[PDB]
Structures are given as C-alpha cells and as structure tokens.
Amino acid sequence: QDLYLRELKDTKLAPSTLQDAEGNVKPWNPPQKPNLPELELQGPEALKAYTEQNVETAHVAKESEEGESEPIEEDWLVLDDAEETKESH
C-alpha cells in the first residue's frame, strides 16, 4: 500500500538518526545527545536536593544519654524531694 509503506519508512527514518542511529537529531536543530542523557540526567537531582539526598547521607545515631552515672546526688535529691511532698499528701 503506497499510502502505507511511504509513511512507514518516513516515520522510521525521521527518528532513525534520533534514536536508532547516532546521528544526533535532524528534525530539530538543538542537540539531544548532550541534553537528555547528560543535562537531564541530573534533572531529578536538580529538582531534588543534589549531593544531599541522592547520596542518602547516613547520620550515625547519637548515643542515648542517661543519668550520667550519678548514684549519690540523684538518689539523695529524689529522696529529699519526695520527703518534702510526703508531708502534704
């Protein structure tokens, strides 16, 4: 079918240099080889936080603090404070 074959190879050759062959891109002047593979490759990184989220910075968990080894002052102070409130129950 002449209505078929010629439109078929026209729709094949126009993106042939675009996609199949490495002839940059003929239909539109701006280059595509250094744009989507190269300039837009950082596109997700450009929209997002580059070198901050794509690297997935892992912060080591800070050591959970405690009474800081206070076996005398803390216990005595707690006992005294409870004694203060025990007279007013």
Binding site: L47, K48, Q53, E56, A58, H59, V60, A61, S64
Partner: protein, 52 residues
C-alpha cells in the same frame, strides 16, 4: 482510722518493686527503637529517591 490508712502500705512495696523495675527497663529499652529509626529513615529516603 490510722489503722485503716496503714492497712494500705501492707503490699505496696511488692507491686512497686516490679513497677520501678519495669519503668526504667522499658524507658531504656527504646535504644533499639532509636537504632531502628535511622535505618527506617534511610529506607524512606531510598524509596523516595528511586521513586524520584
């Protein structure tokens, strides 16, 4: 009335034993939760970044 009031210290120590034990026990057993929090955050970041 004082007798009735003192009747209630009879067994408070036995229960408050396990109470004071498990209080600090459970409060300090969240260390593994803290260690899991950073792993969960890393996993969330990974899923979000590959979704991106």
């Amino acid at each position: 009335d004082r007798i009735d009031s003192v009747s209630q210290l009879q067994n408070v120590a036995e229960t408050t034993k396990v109470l004071f034990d498990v209080s600090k026990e459970t409060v300090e057993l969240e260390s593994e939760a803290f260690e899991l929090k950073q792993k969960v955050e890393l996993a969330h970041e990974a899923k979000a970044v590959l979704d991106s």
